[PDB]
Coordinates of C-alpha atoms in Angstrom, one line a residue:
Chain I
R1 CA 13.1 70.3 -14.7
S2 CA 15.4 67.9 -14.0
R3 CA 17.8 69.9 -11.9
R4 CA 14.9 70.5 -8.8
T5 CA 16.4 67.2 -8.7
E6 CA 19.8 67.4 -8.6
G7 CA 19.6 70.3 -6.1
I8 CA 17.8 67.9 -3.4
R9 CA 20.7 65.7 -3.9
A10 CA 23.5 68.7 -4.1
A11 CA 21.8 69.4 -0.9
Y12 CA 22.2 65.4 0.3
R13 CA 26.5 65.3 -1.2
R14 CA 27.2 67.8 1.1
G15 CA 25.8 66.6 3.8
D16 CA 23.1 69.5 3.8
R17 CA 19.7 67.3 5.5
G18 CA 18.2 70.9 6.0
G19 CA 18.3 72.5 2.6
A20 CA 17.6 69.4 1.1
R21 CA 13.9 69.3 3.4
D22 CA 13.7 72.8 1.6
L23 CA 14.3 72.0 -1.9
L24 CA 12.4 68.5 -1.8
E25 CA 9.3 70.3 -0.3
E26 CA 9.6 72.9 -3.1
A27 CA 10.2 70.3 -6.1
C28 CA 6.5 68.0 -4.2
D29 CA 4.7 71.1 -5.2
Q30 CA 6.3 71.5 -8.5
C31 CA 6.5 67.4 -9.5
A32 CA 3.1 66.7 -10.3
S33 CA 3.3 62.9 -11.4
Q34 CA 3.7 59.5 -10.5
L35 CA 7.5 58.7 -11.7
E36 CA 8.4 62.6 -10.6
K37 CA 7.3 61.8 -7.2
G38 CA 8.7 58.4 -6.9
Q39 CA 12.1 59.6 -7.7
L40 CA 12.1 62.5 -5.1
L41 CA 11.0 59.6 -2.9
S42 CA 13.8 57.4 -4.2
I43 CA 16.4 60.3 -3.3
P44 CA 16.3 60.4 0.3
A45 CA 16.0 56.5 0.8
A46 CA 19.3 55.9 -1.5
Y47 CA 20.6 58.0 1.0
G48 CA 19.1 56.2 3.5
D49 CA 17.3 59.5 5.0
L50 CA 14.8 57.6 7.1
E51 CA 13.2 60.6 8.5
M52 CA 12.0 61.9 5.5
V53 CA 10.9 59.0 3.2
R54 CA 8.6 59.0 6.7
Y55 CA 7.5 63.1 6.0
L56 CA 7.1 62.0 2.0
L57 CA 5.6 59.3 2.9
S58 CA 3.0 60.0 5.6
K59 CA 2.9 64.0 4.9
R60 CA 3.3 64.2 1.2
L61 CA 1.5 60.8 1.0
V62 CA 3.7 59.7 -2.1
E63 CA 3.1 56.8 -4.2
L64 CA 5.5 53.9 -4.0
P65 CA 5.9 52.3 -7.2
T66 CA 5.5 48.8 -7.9
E67 CA 8.0 48.8 -10.5
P68 CA 10.8 46.3 -10.1
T69 CA 13.5 48.7 -11.6
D70 CA 16.4 50.1 -10.0
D71 CA 15.2 53.1 -9.6
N72 CA 12.4 52.2 -7.3
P73 CA 12.7 53.9 -3.5
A74 CA 12.2 50.9 -1.8
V75 CA 15.1 48.7 -4.2
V76 CA 17.4 51.3 -3.6
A77 CA 16.5 51.3 -0.1
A78 CA 17.5 47.2 -0.3
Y79 CA 21.1 48.2 -2.7
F80 CA 21.9 50.3 -0.1
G81 CA 20.7 48.2 3.0
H82 CA 19.6 50.8 5.1
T83 CA 17.0 48.6 6.5
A84 CA 14.8 50.6 8.6
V85 CA 14.3 52.4 4.9
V86 CA 12.8 49.5 3.2
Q87 CA 10.1 48.5 5.5
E88 CA 9.6 51.9 5.9
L89 CA 8.7 52.4 2.1
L90 CA 7.2 48.5 2.2
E91 CA 4.6 49.3 4.8
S92 CA 3.1 52.2 2.5
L93 CA 1.4 49.5 -0.7
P94 CA -2.1 49.8 -0.6
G95 CA -4.2 46.9 -1.2
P96 CA -4.7 43.3 -0.4
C97 CA -2.4 41.9 -3.6
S98 CA 0.9 42.8 -2.2
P99 CA 3.9 43.3 -5.2
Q100 CA 5.9 39.9 -4.6
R101 CA 7.5 40.3 -7.5
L102 CA 9.7 43.4 -6.2
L103 CA 10.0 41.8 -3.5
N104 CA 11.7 39.1 -5.2
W105 CA 13.7 42.0 -7.2
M106 CA 14.9 43.5 -4.2
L107 CA 15.6 40.4 -2.2
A108 CA 17.9 38.5 -4.9
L109 CA 19.1 42.4 -5.1
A110 CA 19.9 41.9 -1.8
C111 CA 21.4 38.5 -1.2
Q112 CA 23.6 39.9 -4.3
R113 CA 24.3 43.3 -2.4
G114 CA 24.9 40.9 1.3
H115 CA 22.1 42.9 3.3
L116 CA 21.5 40.2 5.4
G117 CA 19.7 42.0 6.7
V118 CA 17.4 43.1 4.4
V119 CA 16.9 40.0 3.0
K120 CA 16.0 38.6 6.6
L121 CA 13.1 41.4 6.7
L122 CA 11.9 40.6 2.8
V123 CA 11.9 36.4 3.5
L124 CA 10.6 35.8 6.9
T125 CA 7.9 39.7 7.3
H126 CA 6.8 40.6 4.1
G127 CA 7.2 36.8 2.5
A128 CA 9.5 36.7 -0.8
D129 CA 9.9 33.4 -2.5
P130 CA 13.3 32.0 -1.6
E131 CA 13.1 29.7 -4.6
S132 CA 11.0 31.6 -7.4
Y133 CA 13.1 34.2 -10.1
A134 CA 14.1 38.0 -9.4
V135 CA 13.0 38.5 -13.3
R136 CA 11.8 41.5 -14.2
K137 CA 10.6 43.0 -17.9
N138 CA 12.6 41.7 -20.7
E139 CA 14.8 39.7 -18.3
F140 CA 15.6 35.7 -18.3
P141 CA 14.3 33.5 -15.2
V142 CA 18.1 33.1 -14.8
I143 CA 19.9 30.9 -11.7
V144 CA 21.6 34.1 -10.7
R145 CA 18.3 35.7 -9.9
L146 CA 17.7 33.0 -7.6
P147 CA 18.5 34.2 -4.6
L148 CA 20.2 30.8 -2.8
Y149 CA 22.4 30.7 -5.8
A150 CA 23.1 34.5 -6.1
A151 CA 24.1 34.2 -1.9
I152 CA 26.4 31.3 -2.1
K153 CA 27.9 32.3 -5.1
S154 CA 28.5 35.8 -4.0
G155 CA 30.7 34.0 -1.9
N156 CA 27.2 35.4 1.4
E157 CA 27.7 32.5 2.5
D158 CA 25.4 33.9 5.5
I159 CA 22.9 34.6 3.5
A160 CA 22.5 31.7 1.4
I161 CA 22.6 29.2 5.0
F162 CA 19.9 31.2 6.2
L163 CA 17.3 30.6 3.0
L164 CA 18.4 26.5 3.5
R165 CA 17.7 27.2 6.9
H166 CA 13.6 29.2 6.8
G167 CA 12.4 27.4 3.0
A168 CA 15.5 27.3 0.2
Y169 CA 16.6 24.1 -1.5
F170 CA 19.4 22.7 -3.0
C171 CA 19.4 21.8 -6.6
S172 CA 21.5 19.9 -9.4
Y173 CA 22.9 23.7 -10.7
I174 CA 23.9 24.6 -7.0
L175 CA 26.2 21.3 -6.2
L176 CA 27.2 20.9 -10.1
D177 CA 28.1 24.8 -10.6
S178 CA 29.5 25.3 -6.7
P179 CA 30.0 22.4 -5.7
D180 CA 33.3 23.2 -3.4
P181 CA 30.5 25.8 -1.1
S182 CA 28.0 23.1 -1.7
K183 CA 29.9 19.8 -0.2
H184 CA 31.1 22.6 2.9
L185 CA 27.7 24.0 3.7
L186 CA 25.9 20.5 3.8
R187 CA 29.0 18.7 5.8
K188 CA 28.6 21.8 8.2
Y189 CA 25.2 23.1 8.4
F190 CA 22.9 20.5 8.7
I191 CA 25.6 17.4 11.4
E192 CA 24.4 16.4 15.3
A193 CA 27.6 15.2 16.3
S194 CA 27.5 12.0 18.5
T195 CA 32.8 9.4 14.7
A196 CA 28.6 8.5 14.7
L197 CA 27.5 11.8 13.3
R198 CA 23.6 12.3 12.2
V199 CA 23.3 14.1 9.5
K200 CA 19.4 15.5 8.1
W201 CA 19.6 16.5 4.2
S202 CA 16.4 16.0 3.9
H203 CA 13.8 18.0 2.8
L204 CA 16.2 19.7 0.7
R205 CA 15.1 18.2 -3.1
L206 CA 18.3 17.2 -3.3
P207 CA 18.3 15.5 -6.8
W208 CA 21.2 13.1 -6.3
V209 CA 24.0 11.8 -3.5
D210 CA 27.7 11.3 -3.7
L211 CA 29.8 9.1 -1.8
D212 CA 32.5 12.7 -2.4
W213 CA 30.0 14.4 0.1
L214 CA 30.5 12.5 3.3
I215 CA 31.7 8.8 3.2
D216 CA 35.2 10.3 4.7
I217 CA 33.2 10.2 8.2
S218 CA 32.0 6.2 6.8
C219 CA 34.6 4.8 10.6
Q220 CA 30.8 5.1 11.7
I221 CA 28.1 7.2 10.5
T222 CA 28.0 9.0 7.4
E223 CA 24.3 10.3 6.8
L224 CA 21.1 9.5 8.8
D225 CA 18.3 11.4 7.0
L226 CA 17.5 10.9 3.1
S227 CA 14.0 11.2 2.8
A228 CA 11.9 13.8 1.7
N229 CA 13.5 15.3 -1.5
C230 CA 13.4 14.1 -5.7
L231 CA 16.6 11.6 -5.2
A232 CA 15.5 8.6 -8.3
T233 CA 19.5 6.4 -7.3
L234 CA 20.9 6.0 -4.8
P235 CA 24.8 4.6 -4.4
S236 CA 25.3 0.7 -2.7
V237 CA 27.4 2.2 -0.3
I238 CA 24.4 4.5 1.5
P239 CA 21.9 0.5 2.4
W240 CA 25.1 -0.8 2.9
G241 CA 28.0 0.0 3.2
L242 CA 28.7 2.3 6.2
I243 CA 29.4 0.8 9.9
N244 CA 27.7 1.9 12.7
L245 CA 24.6 3.7 11.1
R246 CA 21.7 2.3 13.7
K247 CA 18.8 4.0 11.4
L248 CA 17.8 5.0 7.7
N249 CA 15.3 6.9 6.4
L250 CA 15.1 6.7 2.4
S251 CA 12.0 7.4 2.2
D252 CA 9.5 10.0 0.7
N253 CA 11.6 10.3 -2.4
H254 CA 11.7 8.8 -7.2
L255 CA 13.6 5.6 -4.8
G256 CA 11.7 2.7 -7.3
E257 CA 14.7 0.3 -7.0
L258 CA 17.3 0.6 -4.2
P259 CA 20.6 -1.4 -4.6
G260 CA 20.9 -5.6 -3.9
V261 CA 23.7 -7.5 -3.1
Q262 CA 24.7 -10.7 -3.9
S263 CA 25.6 -12.3 -0.5
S264 CA 26.3 -10.6 2.9
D265 CA 29.7 -10.8 2.5
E266 CA 29.1 -6.4 0.1
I267 CA 27.2 -5.8 4.1
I268 CA 29.0 -3.9 6.2
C269 CA 26.0 -1.7 7.7
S270 CA 25.3 -4.8 9.7
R271 CA 23.9 -2.8 12.5
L272 CA 20.9 -1.8 11.0
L273 CA 18.3 -1.2 13.6
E274 CA 15.9 0.8 12.1
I275 CA 15.1 1.4 7.6
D276 CA 12.2 3.7 7.0
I277 CA 11.4 3.0 3.1
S278 CA 8.1 4.5 3.1
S279 CA 5.8 6.4 0.3
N280 CA 8.8 5.6 -3.1
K281 CA 7.6 3.7 -5.5
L282 CA 8.9 -0.2 -5.1
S283 CA 7.8 -3.1 -5.9
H284 CA 9.5 -6.0 -3.9
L285 CA 12.6 -5.2 -0.8
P286 CA 16.3 -5.9 -1.7
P287 CA 17.4 -9.7 -0.6
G288 CA 19.9 -7.5 1.4
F289 CA 17.1 -6.7 3.9
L290 CA 17.6 -11.1 5.0
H291 CA 20.7 -10.9 6.4
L292 CA 20.3 -7.9 8.9
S293 CA 19.3 -9.9 11.9
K294 CA 20.0 -7.3 14.7
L295 CA 17.5 -5.2 12.5
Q296 CA 13.9 -4.2 14.4
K297 CA 12.3 -2.2 12.4
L298 CA 10.7 -2.4 8.6
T299 CA 8.4 0.1 7.0
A300 CA 7.6 -0.2 3.3
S301 CA 4.2 1.2 3.1
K302 CA 3.1 3.8 0.7
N303 CA 4.6 1.4 -2.3
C304 CA 3.3 -0.7 -5.2
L305 CA 5.2 -3.9 -3.5
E306 CA 3.8 -6.7 -5.2
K307 CA 6.0 -9.1 -2.7
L308 CA 8.0 -9.1 0.1
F309 CA 10.8 -10.2 -0.9
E310 CA 11.6 -11.9 -4.7
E311 CA 11.1 -15.7 -4.3
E312 CA 14.3 -16.5 -2.9
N313 CA 13.2 -20.2 -1.0
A314 CA 16.5 -22.0 -1.1
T315 CA 18.7 -19.4 0.4
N316 CA 19.8 -19.7 5.0
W317 CA 18.3 -16.3 5.4
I318 CA 18.8 -15.4 8.9
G319 CA 18.1 -11.9 8.9
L320 CA 14.6 -9.9 10.0
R321 CA 15.2 -12.7 12.6
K322 CA 14.8 -9.9 15.3
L323 CA 12.0 -7.6 13.9
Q324 CA 10.2 -6.4 16.4
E325 CA 7.9 -4.2 13.3
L326 CA 6.8 -4.9 9.6
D327 CA 4.8 -2.1 8.3
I328 CA 3.9 -3.6 4.2
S329 CA 0.1 -1.2 4.1
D330 CA -0.3 0.5 1.9
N331 CA 0.7 -1.3 -1.2
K332 CA -0.5 -4.6 -3.8
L333 CA -0.5 -8.1 -2.4
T334 CA -2.1 -11.0 -2.5
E335 CA -0.2 -12.9 -1.1
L336 CA 2.2 -12.7 1.9
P337 CA 4.4 -16.2 1.5
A338 CA 5.0 -18.1 4.6
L339 CA 8.6 -18.5 3.9
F340 CA 10.0 -15.0 4.0
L341 CA 6.5 -14.5 7.3
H342 CA 7.7 -17.8 9.3
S343 CA 11.2 -17.2 9.4
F344 CA 10.8 -13.6 11.6
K345 CA 10.4 -14.0 14.8
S346 CA 10.3 -11.8 17.3
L347 CA 7.8 -9.9 15.5
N348 CA 5.1 -8.2 17.5
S349 CA 3.3 -5.4 15.6
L350 CA 2.4 -6.6 12.0
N351 CA 0.2 -3.7 9.8
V352 CA -0.6 -5.7 5.7
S353 CA -4.2 -3.3 6.1
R354 CA -4.6 -2.8 2.6
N355 CA -3.4 -4.9 0.0
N356 CA -5.1 -6.8 -2.3
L357 CA -4.7 -10.0 0.2
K358 CA -7.1 -13.2 0.2
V359 CA -6.2 -15.3 2.9
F360 CA -4.6 -14.5 5.6
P361 CA -0.7 -16.1 5.6
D362 CA -0.4 -19.3 7.4
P363 CA -0.1 -18.2 11.6
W364 CA 3.3 -19.3 13.2
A365 CA 4.4 -19.1 17.3
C366 CA 5.4 -15.5 17.2
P367 CA 4.3 -13.0 19.8
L368 CA 2.1 -11.0 18.0
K369 CA 0.5 -8.2 19.7
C370 CA -1.7 -6.1 16.6
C371 CA -2.1 -7.4 14.3
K372 CA -4.0 -4.9 11.3
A373 CA -5.0 -6.1 8.1
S374 CA -8.4 -4.9 7.2
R375 CA -9.5 -3.3 3.9
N376 CA -8.4 -6.3 2.2
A377 CA -10.5 -9.0 0.1
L378 CA -9.9 -11.6 3.1
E379 CA -12.5 -15.0 3.1
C380 CA -11.1 -16.5 6.4
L381 CA -8.4 -16.2 8.4
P382 CA -6.9 -19.8 10.1
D383 CA -7.7 -21.6 12.8
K384 CA -4.9 -20.8 15.0
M385 CA -4.7 -17.7 16.3
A386 CA -5.1 -19.4 19.6
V387 CA -2.2 -21.7 19.7
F388 CA 0.2 -19.0 18.9
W389 CA -1.1 -16.0 19.7
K390 CA -3.5 -16.7 23.1
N391 CA -1.5 -14.9 25.2
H392 CA -0.1 -11.9 23.1
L393 CA -2.9 -10.5 20.9
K394 CA -4.7 -7.7 22.0
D395 CA -5.1 -5.3 18.8
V396 CA -6.8 -6.7 15.8
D397 CA -8.3 -5.4 13.3
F398 CA -9.8 -7.8 10.6
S399 CA -12.4 -5.2 9.4
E400 CA -13.7 -3.9 5.6
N401 CA -13.4 -7.9 3.8
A402 CA -15.1 -10.2 2.0
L403 CA -15.0 -12.9 4.7
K404 CA -18.1 -15.1 6.5
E405 CA -17.1 -15.8 9.0
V406 CA -15.4 -16.0 11.8
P407 CA -13.1 -19.1 13.7
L408 CA -13.5 -19.3 16.6
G409 CA -9.5 -18.9 18.0
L410 CA -9.8 -15.1 18.0
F411 CA -12.8 -15.2 20.1
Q412 CA -10.5 -17.6 22.3
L413 CA -8.0 -15.4 22.7
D414 CA -7.4 -14.0 26.1
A415 CA -5.2 -11.2 25.5
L416 CA -7.1 -9.7 22.7
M417 CA -8.9 -6.6 23.8
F418 CA -9.6 -4.5 20.8
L419 CA -11.3 -6.1 18.5
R420 CA -12.7 -4.4 14.9
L421 CA -14.2 -7.0 12.7
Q422 CA -17.3 -5.0 10.6
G423 CA -17.7 -4.1 7.1
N424 CA -17.8 -7.9 6.6
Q425 CA -20.4 -10.2 5.0
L426 CA -20.6 -12.6 8.7
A427 CA -24.5 -13.2 10.0
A428 CA -23.6 -15.7 13.3
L429 CA -20.5 -15.9 15.8
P430 CA -19.5 -18.9 17.7
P431 CA -21.6 -20.0 21.4
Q432 CA -20.8 -17.4 23.9
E433 CA -19.7 -20.0 26.2
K434 CA -17.4 -20.3 24.2
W435 CA -15.9 -17.1 24.3
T436 CA -12.6 -16.1 26.6
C437 CA -11.8 -12.9 25.7
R438 CA -12.0 -11.7 29.1
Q439 CA -10.5 -8.9 28.6
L440 CA -12.5 -7.2 25.8
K441 CA -12.9 -3.7 25.8
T442 CA -14.1 -2.9 22.3
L443 CA -15.8 -4.6 20.2
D444 CA -16.9 -2.9 16.6
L445 CA -19.3 -6.0 15.1
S446 CA -21.1 -3.0 12.8
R447 CA -21.7 -2.9 9.6
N448 CA -22.4 -7.1 8.2
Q449 CA -25.4 -9.5 7.8
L450 CA -25.6 -10.4 11.4
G451 CA -29.5 -10.5 13.1
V452 CA -28.8 -13.9 17.4
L453 CA -26.3 -12.7 18.8
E454 CA -24.4 -13.3 22.5
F455 CA -22.5 -12.7 24.6
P456 CA -20.6 -13.9 28.1
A457 CA -21.8 -12.3 31.5
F458 CA -18.7 -11.7 31.7
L459 CA -18.6 -8.8 29.2
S460 CA -20.8 -6.8 31.9
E461 CA -18.3 -5.4 33.1
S462 CA -15.2 -5.1 30.6
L463 CA -17.1 -3.3 27.2
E464 CA -16.8 0.0 27.5
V465 CA -17.9 -0.2 23.9
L466 CA -20.5 -1.8 21.3
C467 CA -20.9 -1.4 18.2
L468 CA -24.1 -2.5 16.7
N469 CA -25.8 0.0 13.6
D470 CA -26.3 -0.5 9.6
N471 CA -26.6 -5.1 10.7
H472 CA -29.9 -7.0 10.1
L473 CA -31.7 -6.1 13.1
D474 CA -35.6 -6.8 13.4
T475 CA -35.0 -7.0 17.5
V476 CA -32.3 -6.5 19.9
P477 CA -30.0 -9.6 20.8
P478 CA -32.0 -9.7 25.0
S479 CA -28.4 -10.7 26.6
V480 CA -27.3 -6.5 26.2
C481 CA -29.1 -6.6 29.0
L482 CA -25.6 -8.2 30.4
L483 CA -23.6 -5.3 29.6
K484 CA -23.9 -2.9 32.6
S485 CA -20.6 -1.4 32.3
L486 CA -21.2 0.1 28.7
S487 CA -20.9 3.7 28.0
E488 CA -21.5 3.2 25.0
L489 CA -24.1 2.1 22.3
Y490 CA -25.0 2.2 19.0
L491 CA -28.0 0.2 17.6
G492 CA -29.0 2.7 14.5
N493 CA -29.7 2.0 10.9
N494 CA -31.4 -1.1 11.8
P495 CA -35.5 0.2 10.3
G496 CA -36.8 -3.3 11.4
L497 CA -36.0 -1.6 14.6
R498 CA -39.5 -0.7 16.6
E499 CA -39.0 -1.7 20.2
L500 CA -36.5 -0.4 22.3
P501 CA -36.0 -2.8 25.6
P502 CA -36.4 -1.6 29.4
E503 CA -33.6 -3.1 30.1
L504 CA -31.4 -0.9 28.6
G505 CA -32.2 1.7 31.5
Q506 CA -30.4 -1.2 33.5
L507 CA -27.1 -0.5 32.0
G508 CA -26.1 2.5 33.8
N509 CA -22.7 3.9 32.3
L510 CA -24.9 4.7 29.2
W511 CA -24.3 8.2 28.4
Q512 CA -24.4 8.0 24.0
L513 CA -27.0 5.6 22.1
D514 CA -27.8 5.8 18.1
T515 CA -30.6 6.3 18.0
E516 CA -30.4 7.9 14.5
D517 CA -33.8 6.5 12.2
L518 CA -35.5 4.3 15.1
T519 CA -38.9 5.0 15.4
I520 CA -39.3 3.7 19.2
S521 CA -42.8 2.0 19.2
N522 CA -43.0 1.8 22.9
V523 CA -41.4 5.0 23.6
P524 CA -43.2 8.6 23.5
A525 CA -41.7 10.7 20.6
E526 CA -41.5 13.7 23.0
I527 CA -38.9 10.8 25.0
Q528 CA -37.1 10.4 21.7
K529 CA -36.7 13.5 21.0
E530 CA -35.6 14.7 23.3
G531 CA -32.3 12.1 23.7
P532 CA -31.1 9.0 24.8
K533 CA -30.9 10.5 28.3
Chain Y
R1 CA -20.5 8.4 3.3
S2 CA -21.0 12.1 5.2
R3 CA -21.0 9.7 8.4
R4 CA -17.1 10.1 8.6
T5 CA -17.2 13.0 9.3
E6 CA -19.2 12.5 12.4
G7 CA -17.6 10.0 13.5
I8 CA -14.9 11.6 13.1
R9 CA -16.7 14.7 15.2
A10 CA -18.0 11.3 17.5
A11 CA -14.1 10.5 18.9
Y12 CA -13.7 14.5 19.6
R13 CA -16.8 14.5 21.0
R14 CA -16.2 11.9 23.7
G15 CA -13.0 13.2 23.4
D16 CA -11.4 10.7 22.1
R17 CA -8.3 12.5 19.8
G18 CA -6.4 9.6 20.0
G19 CA -9.4 8.6 17.8
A20 CA -10.9 11.6 15.9
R21 CA -6.8 11.0 14.7
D22 CA -7.3 6.8 13.0
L23 CA -10.4 8.0 12.2
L24 CA -9.7 11.3 10.4
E25 CA -6.5 10.0 8.1
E26 CA -9.2 7.1 7.2
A27 CA -11.3 9.8 6.9
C28 CA -7.7 11.4 4.4
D29 CA -7.0 8.5 2.8
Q30 CA -11.1 7.7 1.8
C31 CA -11.6 12.1 1.0
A32 CA -10.2 12.7 -2.8
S33 CA -12.5 15.5 -3.0
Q34 CA -10.9 19.7 -1.6
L35 CA -14.6 19.6 0.1
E36 CA -14.8 16.8 1.7
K37 CA -10.6 17.2 3.3
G38 CA -11.7 20.7 4.0
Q39 CA -14.2 19.7 6.3
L40 CA -12.2 17.3 8.1
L41 CA -10.1 20.4 8.4
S42 CA -12.9 22.7 9.9
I43 CA -13.7 19.5 12.5
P44 CA -10.4 20.5 14.5
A45 CA -9.9 23.2 13.5
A46 CA -13.8 23.6 15.1
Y47 CA -12.8 21.6 17.9
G48 CA -9.8 23.8 18.8
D49 CA -7.2 20.4 18.0
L50 CA -4.2 22.7 17.3
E51 CA -2.0 19.1 16.9
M52 CA -4.2 17.3 14.2
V53 CA -5.0 21.3 12.2
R54 CA -0.9 21.0 12.4
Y55 CA -0.3 17.6 10.7
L56 CA -3.0 17.5 8.1
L57 CA -1.4 21.1 6.4
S58 CA 2.1 19.6 7.3
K59 CA 1.7 16.5 6.6
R60 CA -1.4 15.4 5.2
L61 CA -0.8 19.1 2.8
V62 CA -5.4 20.2 3.4
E63 CA -5.4 22.7 1.6
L64 CA -7.6 25.7 3.1
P65 CA -9.9 27.2 0.6
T66 CA -10.7 30.5 0.6
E67 CA -14.4 31.1 0.4
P68 CA -15.2 33.5 3.3
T69 CA -18.2 31.1 5.3
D70 CA -18.9 30.2 8.3
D71 CA -17.9 26.4 7.0
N72 CA -13.9 27.4 6.9
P73 CA -11.4 26.0 8.8
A74 CA -10.1 29.3 9.6
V75 CA -13.3 31.0 9.9
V76 CA -14.4 28.4 12.7
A77 CA -10.8 28.7 14.1
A78 CA -11.6 32.6 15.1
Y79 CA -15.3 31.6 15.7
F80 CA -14.1 29.5 18.6
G81 CA -11.4 32.0 19.5
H82 CA -8.8 29.7 19.1
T83 CA -5.9 32.3 18.4
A84 CA -3.0 29.6 17.8
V85 CA -5.6 27.6 14.7
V86 CA -6.0 30.6 13.5
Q87 CA -3.0 31.8 12.3
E88 CA -1.3 28.4 11.3
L89 CA -4.0 28.2 9.3
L90 CA -4.0 31.7 7.2
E91 CA 0.1 30.5 7.7
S92 CA -0.3 27.6 5.2
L93 CA -2.3 30.0 2.8
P94 CA -0.3 29.9 -0.4
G95 CA 0.7 32.9 -3.3
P96 CA 0.5 36.3 -2.7
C97 CA -3.3 37.5 -3.4
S98 CA -3.3 37.1 0.4
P99 CA -7.1 36.2 0.1
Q100 CA -8.2 39.4 2.1
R101 CA -11.9 38.5 2.1
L102 CA -11.5 36.0 3.8
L103 CA -9.6 37.7 6.6
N104 CA -12.2 41.0 6.9
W105 CA -15.6 38.4 7.4

């Protein structure tokens, strides 16, 4: 019975493809069982006769088993690198549950064999996992069955780098077991030369890095992006042992602590211009940052910070003097001591929102163009805003806080035009005659205990949106009639209202109105149902 | 709580895509449950903002439910013919068992 197989094989062994066709048809008629038909389909696939595979799949309708074995026709097709036969067989697999197990098995087989095209088609077209194990039944998930490891250990560097560029990751075993080719790939295929290189080792899940990998080129730059991985520690050279770095991305990792310094003498990276250490597990920043006078951006948000810096209230700090951006939001800071904060001179953007802050930091003469401190427990704001930021601050977000009254200073500002002052307990404003926010475009004064609200007449040409929903409003303040230029208004969530003023019709620019759960006595039900227009 | 949705929708209703981004990030921080995140992903997909769908799938890592419902972000993406958004969402589906049921729907 098995002879039929050999006979067909004989026809292919001598190159007699037509005789192989005849013997194959005879066996298919005599091969009723699924295993025998699968073997018949394996014969030409192993040989490489794509045409006869097509005939068997199309006319004989031969089933393609999903067993991840070397007897499988697709496995042998991948074994010999016959990409056309592999795709032809894989197309015949029925049902939605694509048999990934077979795909990983043949993927690792191709990686071991060196058939790059088969690996490419499997991973890119059929979605075979480049980071799972090609493990069969009664087999263990050993790294030898992992396709990147099998590719690089086999000497198939091209397949390994292709896998890395198309979803594979490095791990401790790769670096420890094959450090030479691993460092070769790290030192070649992630380098953007510019000397002052730009090396992107991020998104590689590297559990550790070594000076041995690139410190030889620390003359100007070794690397810049080490984010998006599982790093838990660093050499101190990575912070400050490199000469002409300009940007470092040390974010999105397990770096709960960064190496520190004893003085500025230990810092060689005096040229750093931005640093990204967010999305880490930091409780405080190292004081070495307080020696980088040239650093222009620091972003240490998405951390567990309790303080910006340790209480070094004696040292002549010069660093961060020219810092423009400090983003330390999404942290657990209750106090922002005036020491380090007043050491700044060039800050313009301060993002300290989403913290446990209760007192806004004691202000100082520094040109803040924008400040976000919402999602805090802030009780009040300083009165020196108009002293320092009268001509600088444009965006303010002190909303969602425990604040009860905004002093006149915020509204005495001139450059201020973007106000988010909701989510507070404020119930009364400073008199409108004291307001100098001529450039005001958006005023979000919702979600508070405000009732009368007054506006400068100048805002007749300035405001584009005004939010006053969800307040203690029983009657619309008549001052709204001033705001001809207003385009969007909220008045909903005010159950005490019954009259909609006629003067709102004078506000020509209106296109939308929050009429949510507002019953208007002086408007018929039909007009209310039709909408704001 | 539902207001967040409408607020983001408002930003897209007037064409304010950056304001929609800000409101979307705020809601994502305040939307922990899978259904709320799926709704947040449905908003731009129904609108057609492929960029914000990409940001949600890549950065926020928003889960894509396999329920064959008109609330599904991919279903609404197919509803308005936004082919790019449909492929972007369908690429995010994990695992080997490709949810054919959603695909037929």
